[PDB]
Amino acid sequence: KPKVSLNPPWNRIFKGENVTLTCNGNNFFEVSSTKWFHNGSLSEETNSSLNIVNAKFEDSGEYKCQHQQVNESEPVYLEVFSDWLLLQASAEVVMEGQPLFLRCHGWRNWDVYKVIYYKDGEALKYWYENHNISITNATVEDSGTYYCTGKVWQLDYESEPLNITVIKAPR
Amino acid sequence: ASTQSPSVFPLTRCCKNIPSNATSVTLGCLATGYFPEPVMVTWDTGSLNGTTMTLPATTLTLSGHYATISLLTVSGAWAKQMFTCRVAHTPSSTDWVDNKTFSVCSRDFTPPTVKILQSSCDGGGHFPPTIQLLCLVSGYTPGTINITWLEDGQVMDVDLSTASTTQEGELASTQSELTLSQKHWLSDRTYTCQVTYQGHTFEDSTKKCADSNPRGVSAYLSRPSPFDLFIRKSPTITCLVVDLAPSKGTVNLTWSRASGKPVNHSTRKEEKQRNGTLTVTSTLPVGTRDWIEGETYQCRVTHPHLPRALMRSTTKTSGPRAAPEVYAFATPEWPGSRDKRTLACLIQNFMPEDISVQWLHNEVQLPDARHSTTQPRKTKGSGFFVFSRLEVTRAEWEQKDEFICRAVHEAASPSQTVQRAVSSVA
Amino acid sequence: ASTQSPSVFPLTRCCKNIPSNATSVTLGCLATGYFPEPVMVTWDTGSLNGTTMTLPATTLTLSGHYATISLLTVSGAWAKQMFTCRVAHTPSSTDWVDNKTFSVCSRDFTPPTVKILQSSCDGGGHFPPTIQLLCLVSGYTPGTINITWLEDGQVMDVDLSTASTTQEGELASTQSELTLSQKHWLSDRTYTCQVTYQGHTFEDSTKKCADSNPRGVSAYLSRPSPFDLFIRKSPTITCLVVDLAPSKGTVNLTWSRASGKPVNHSTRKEEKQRNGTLTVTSTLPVGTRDWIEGETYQCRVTHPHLPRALMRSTTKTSGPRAAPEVYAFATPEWPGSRDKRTLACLIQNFMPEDISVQWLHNEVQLPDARHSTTQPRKTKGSGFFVFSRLEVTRAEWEQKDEFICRAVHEAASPSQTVQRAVSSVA
Amino acid sequence: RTVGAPSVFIFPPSDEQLKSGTASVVCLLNNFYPREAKVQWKVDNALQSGNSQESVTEQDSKDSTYSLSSTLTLSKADYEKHKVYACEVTHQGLSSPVTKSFNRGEC
Amino acid sequence: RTVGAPSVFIFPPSDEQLKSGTASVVCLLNNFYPREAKVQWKVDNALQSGNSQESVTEQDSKDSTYSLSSTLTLSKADYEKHKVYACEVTHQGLSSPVTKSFNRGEC
Ligand SMILES: *[C@@H]1O[C@H](CO)[C@@H](O[C@@H]2O[C@H](CO)[C@@H](O[C@@H]3O[C@H](CO[C@H]4O[C@H](CO)[C@@H](O)[C@H](O)[C@@H]4O)[C@@H](O)[C@H](O[C@H]4O[C@H](CO)[C@@H](O)[C@H](O)[C@@H]4O)[C@@H]3O)[C@H](O)[C@H]2NC(C)=O)[C@H](O)[C@H]1NC(C)=O
Ligand SMILES: *[C@@H]1O[C@H](CO)[C@@H](O[C@@H]2O[C@H](CO)[C@@H](O[C@@H]3O[C@H](CO[C@H]4O[C@H](CO)[C@@H](O)[C@H](O)[C@@H]4O)[C@@H](O)[C@H](O[C@H]4O[C@H](CO)[C@@H](O)[C@H](O)[C@@H]4O)[C@@H]3O)[C@H](O)[C@H]2NC(C)=O)[C@H](O)[C@H]1NC(C)=O
Ligand SMILES: *[C@@H]1O[C@H](CO)[C@@H](O[C@@H]2O[C@H](CO)[C@@H](O[C@H]3O[C@H](CO[C@H]4O[C@H](CO)[C@@H](O)[C@H](O)[C@@H]4O)[C@@H](O)[C@H](O[C@H]4O[C@H](CO)[C@@H](O)[C@H](O)[C@@H]4O)[C@@H]3O)[C@H](O)[C@H]2NC(C)=O)[C@H](O)[C@H]1NC(C)=O
Ligand SMILES: *[C@@H]1O[C@H](CO)[C@@H](O[C@@H]2O[C@H](CO)[C@@H](O[C@H]3O[C@H](CO[C@H]4O[C@H](CO)[C@@H](O)[C@H](O)[C@@H]4O)[C@@H](O)[C@H](O[C@H]4O[C@H](CO)[C@@H](O)[C@H](O)[C@@H]4O)[C@@H]3O)[C@H](O)[C@H]2NC(C)=O)[C@H](O)[C@H]1NC(C)=O
Ligand SMILES: *[C@@H]1O[C@H](CO)[C@@H](O[C@@H]2O[C@H](CO)[C@@H](O)[C@H](O)[C@H]2NC(C)=O)[C@H](O)[C@H]1NC(C)=O
Ligand SMILES: *[C@@H]1O[C@H](CO)[C@@H](O[C@@H]2O[C@H](CO)[C@@H](O)[C@H](O)[C@H]2NC(C)=O)[C@H](O)[C@H]1NC(C)=O
Ligand SMILES: *[C@@H]1O[C@H](CO)[C@@H](O[C@@H]2O[C@H](CO)[C@@H](O)[C@H](O)[C@H]2NC(C)=O)[C@H](O)[C@H]1NC(C)=O
Ligand SMILES: *[C@@H]1O[C@H](CO)[C@@H](O)[C@H](O)[C@H]1NC(C)=O
Ligand SMILES: *[C@@H]1O[C@H](CO)[C@@H](O)[C@H](O)[C@H]1NC(C)=O
């Protein structure tokens, strides 16, 4: 089947930010045209990559793609927020040992200082500036509801929490 | 629209443009910012003759206010004669009189200028243990001059600074030196050099320097004061938004009630500060019964450069109630304090925390600035307390030695006020 | 070794060391740093008759060259007489003659002082388009003076700065103003003011400052509490550094005095906080007298990830002194509260702001948790005030009904302590 | 009556009005006939519109003339953003439009 | 001959030697007999050793006394950091060791 790829990979963006959904599978059938499915409705884009420009609140929701095959792609979900700090994350469900990058991101390239990540309530790591937590070998205990506290323009802001859960790759 | 009192300002032609041989001159007064019509203007010319003529008013488009100009034309010894304009607005009050007294010419002098220099930190980037601020008032026409230093706007004692004036030729030069600890300088406080010269004010500002100064908008929302709620009976709430970056455009500021019932019209002031920000204040009148019965009011702040809307809300405290205890005291007489005394008041065991404290003397409630009042703090048991301190002078207690400390508080009975008198001599 | 010419220098006593009534004086010339032997020294004494004397040379240990002193003792009008010493070194050359001409009281060294002042940045901390540096040479005996500016040790063009000189009484003052671009100031180059007075060089330097928070870390440094200082006679100061990273590599914490005298060991302590940050706290005991006489204490922190060392400094106040007034009151009985009272203490008009407040009952100091004291705030005139509040029980005043409010403050005499007792029944 | 020229005057805002946070630069046209008088405000030689309010008086009972005052209303900050302030008076009694000007710092 | 006391003098370094970067503090002991004279260097009331060179002449042919010059050699920074410089002369002709001193502030 054609799986759906995200550039940048992050399914949680800010209002107004861009993202481009690309969708590809094994080339058993030659690539001619693609179908897009915002919420269930067919989008007016044929191209294999759809560029979601300037996010609005209505740009939220279930996304899906399709080719001339007999069967469809998975229901990737894209929530869109306007707020001060969004604790972005690579994937919402991962299997151990895949790369996981986390990023406590601030509105319009703004720089968040005194950044602290929380995993399930406890302080996982703190750094002076914003950082890219990166765990390449996710453990099954890594599953938690995460959130990050930061300081943007001298004021304190907590991101909305986001739960992530790992699974065992055998079975 | 509410009744508004006019602001009266002079209007004289500028004397470099006035010919010296002109035997006659026209001056005037602008009365602007009042509701409703009319005002009456009279002119006292001293001893000269004069012709008074008042124009029809102009309705200001932006605010709907009225602006009228009343002119006087005089002849004779015009340049040396005092001139007074007296404006009465009987809608404001029957005895409302604005008296503005001035001359045709306030004369021409060279502008003084002000600049502030500072100690340099050393070759390693470290501050010295004390910081010198040197306020320099460059060449001005010799005259009486005063320099005041302010720390975040509050006057410091003159003992902590020096001042020096020299004269070279026909021009004076003034310098003032202020000494500060390194600790105060590193705390990012802002210091103002205030120059008073011939009844005109100049100023300059400084704070600890910086390679960069990020700042963001913050917002605060007050409750009505008990004094305004129960004595004045005209409660208001204020949404104050500070430290916004003066970008392009006006900041969107909206009042709403959780019930969906209508809000009154609010007033809005925007003011640039010494420290580089723009502070916006919005004041909303609230209903007295509305507030007392538990309504919740919301201030919503939006701006295109903001990430999200900023929201603040305010409502009557849901805690229990308890009446204030009041105690007033005078300090004893001792050496060095013969003609100035200090009075004190303790207000305690009240609940909830919002309270207004004033001092009354001889059938006038003295201005709030005369005294100081601490912030409410928790008692060990149940309720809050505050202290108030009032320095008084000999003429006041010789006028009347009874000084009343009064607290206004929602739980006080029977009329939401409690007061106690003290006499210093007994 | 190699052949080296002697360096010839005069040798005369200080003008305050030579007695005015001396009938004879001994002067000399030191010829140092020559190799091999010998040198030949002669003296031109003008019209006076004197006795010359040549000593054997002493070999310099560091280079192996020779150093000799040639003295001359004269009598008569030796103060006004001009003396020449003529040294030749025949290994160097047959006609190398060093003629050093000087009087017995030619001059004493006179150190002009150097200080660098600088432009302001404004009230938002932003830099102006240019930076002024003002080098001041204040209060020196008049004479020839030159001022040169260096940028990273190279002489800048003469037209880029302007110097001026004034005189007041005996003492002279000189100033020089340099204009820099904002970019140059912000590049962190070092600027040196080089003052050459009577042929000798005096220097001061500056570079872009360092604003106390390089990587978002904060550091705070307290003063001793007056209670610790004057009652326990064990004053301590505390340096606390917050928001460091929990990485490896221990932080380097060092204490020092500006005078270089030794400091004791401190209580170095680290602990990770619940929010994932790391705080380091150290408490240093300091000498009581050392503090009272105005020593400056410095806390210096270095972490491997920080780009430069971070320093904080603390010292005693530089303002005037005023002892506190202490007033103590007992509340009268309030209906329904038979078994409790509140004691209020007003402490006022003291300078500087540092103060400790204690309460005592039955000659023993009560726990701090029993009473609440406000933070120092300014009075209307000179000095600061605080209020203290203590709730007491019937069992306590029936045990002993006298309670003492005691203030410890640096300006109080004779032992930095003033107290006032109060009774609830009277 | 005959055609009377306007006596053209200009008045700055007072320092107390600058303390109040507003500014009203006045151009007075005293004792003109006929009533058709045009006042054009310029600030640093840039024409202004939407902030000029012209109070026009009645016909005087003695000389049968009229009076006018054009009030240019600005903010305090907008007042000190500029230096030159002038008003141009076009009228039948003036052969050319008379421009009366002043500056802030000379006063 | 008879026991002669040293006339003890102290000479500061010249400012030209400070321009050269060295400093030679001289203590002159004039006209003393016998030759056994001890010179000690007290810099800010701290005894110095290993940086002093004593030059002694032969017996004079007129008074049969001796002349000594003790030279304390230091750097310019080492000279400028210290304030009071003194030489203490112990000799048979002196009942107490005579200390002759000067101060950098007044020299
Ligand atoms: C640049 O310059 C501007 C102007 O000087 C500074 O603006 C100040 O900002 C501070 C905070 O950012 C303001 O302080 C706030 O004032 C509010 C107004 O309350 C006043 O009015 C009530 C009457 O109802 C009085 O009782 C009260 O005492 C005040 O006089 C307060 O309500 C705020 O309190 C809030 O914060 C405290 C914590 O500090 C909480 O405990 C409270 O519960 C409440 O939430 C607050 O104190 C200050 O008023 C502003 N100045 C002016 C003139 O308005 C900028 O801060 C400055 N920026 C920099 C970087 O220097
Ligand atoms: C993670 O959690 C830690 C705590 O575990 C937080 O660390 C706190 O950081 C704050 C911010 O600096 C600290 O607050 C500071 O406390 C100092 C302690 O002073 C003591 O002594 C004085 C005088 O006797 C007392 O009055 C005071 O109450 C204390 O007992 C204060 O001196 C500091 O004052 C500073 O701010 C004021 C304005 O409020 C200025 O006027 C001052 O000049 C000065 O600049 C300050 O209040 C706090 O103490 C720290 N906690 C602990 C336990 O020490 C971290 O901040 C937190 N991480 C993040 C990212 O927030
Ligand atoms: C495809 O299906 C999707 C879901 O099936 C649809 O997504 C939904 O769209 C609506 C409207 O576009 C979203 O509602 C959002 O907008 C209103 C109005 O915005 C105001 O409130 C915001 C509060 O966050 C402010 O930030 C704004 O500035 C503005 O003042 C909000 O009231 C909503 O907020 C609520 O929901 C969000 C989470 O979405 C919470 O964070 C808030 O606290 C509050 O509870 C929304 O912001 C709706 O959120 C969205 N659904 C999701 C899951 O995001 C989509 O419209 C549809 N598309 C098409 C083409 O059919
Ligand atoms: C990411 O992490 C989040 C944080 O843990 C997860 O949210 C959690 O969801 C669970 C639901 O599975 C919540 O658990 C219960 O929440 C409320 C609170 O229960 C209270 O009342 C009960 C009596 O009714 C008591 O017995 C409880 O002890 C408690 O006091 C319940 O109402 C829920 O009931 C729901 O689920 C049951 C099935 O279990 C249904 O039968 C019910 O009809 C109802 O629909 C839950 O029992 C938990 O509180 C919540 N955590 C937080 C912090 O909010 C989130 O699910 C997770 N997501 C992923 C993808 O991993
Ligand atoms: C989101 O993507 C669009 C598409 O490229 C960007 O649009 C460009 O905008 C810049 C200036 O804003 C123009 O110079 C380009 O021509 C635009 N590109 C196209 C293809 O038209 C847009 O800028 C992006 N948004 C953000 C916030 O980066
Ligand atoms: C997803 O793709 C697979 C690929 O064939 C589909 O599998 C067949 O689906 C039909 C559905 O009508 C069944 O009748 C067949 O028996 C399935 N083939 C098998 C099981 O070998 C599958 O149906 C597709 N799913 C959807 C929803 O289209
Ligand atoms: C977190 O990781 C992402 C991707 O791994 C980083 O995004 C890159 O940032 C650099 C520098 O800002 C850019 O040049 C790249 O183009 C970005 N790549 C992508 C895919 O976005 C992000 O910067 C990292 N965050 C931190 C704090 O290092
Ligand atoms: C789709 O791809 C084609 C191929 O280059 C391109 O010309 C076209 O612009 C694309 N459409 C969009 C919407 O990007
Ligand atoms: C994760 O750790 C295990 C340790 O047993 C190792 O075998 C595996 O290769 C690691 N995977 C990655 C992606 O580092």
Side-chain angles (χ1 to χ4, degrees), chain B residues 196-254:
Chain B
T196 302
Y197 171 81
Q198 316 269 315
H200 286 114
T201 67
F202 313 95
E203 312 290 329
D204 204 350
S205 285
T206 183
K207 66 173 206 176
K208 158 167 157 187
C209 207
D211 292 333
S212 72
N213 302 304
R215 206 80 208 170
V217 61
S218 315
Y220 309 91
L221 178 56
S222 302
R223 295 187 294 275
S225 174
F227 176 70
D228 289 345
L229 195 40
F230 303 120
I231 307 291
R232 194 185 135 192
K233 298 135 188 203
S234 71
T236 61
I237 58 181
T238 297
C239 188
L240 178 69
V241 64
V242 304
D243 280 352
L244 62 84
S247 72
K248 45 172 183 180
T250 192
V251 55
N252 168 9
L253 195 45
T254 58

Side-chain angles (χ1 to χ4, degrees), chain C residues 32-58:
Chain C
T32 183
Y34 69 99
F35 190 83
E37 282 294 311
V39 286
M40 172 294 307
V41 190
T42 51
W43 282 92
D44 196 9
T45 81
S47 62
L48 294 185
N49 296 326
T51 55
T52 60
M53 182 179 72
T54 307
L55 282 71
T58 51

Side-chain angles (χ1 to χ4, degrees), chain A residues 98-112:
Chain A
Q98 278 174 357
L100 278 74
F101 297 167
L102 297 81
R103 163 151 259 198
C104 185
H105 186 33
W107 189 249
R108 279 170 161 207
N109 271 37
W110 288 355
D111 49 315
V112 57

Side-chain angles (χ1 to χ4, degrees), chain C residues 152-186:
Chain C
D152 284 344
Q154 197 261 332
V155 173
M156 64 184 76
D157 46 340
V158 179
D159 68 326
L160 206 64
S161 66
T162 42
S164 296
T165 51
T166 178
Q167 285 159 344
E168 59 277 15
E170 194 266 331
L171 297 171
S173 296
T174 300
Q175 66 180 0
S176 174
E177 187 40 74
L178 172 72
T179 76
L180 298 174
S181 68
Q182 197 188 336
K183 176 162 68 173
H184 281 181
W185 185 241
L186 288 186

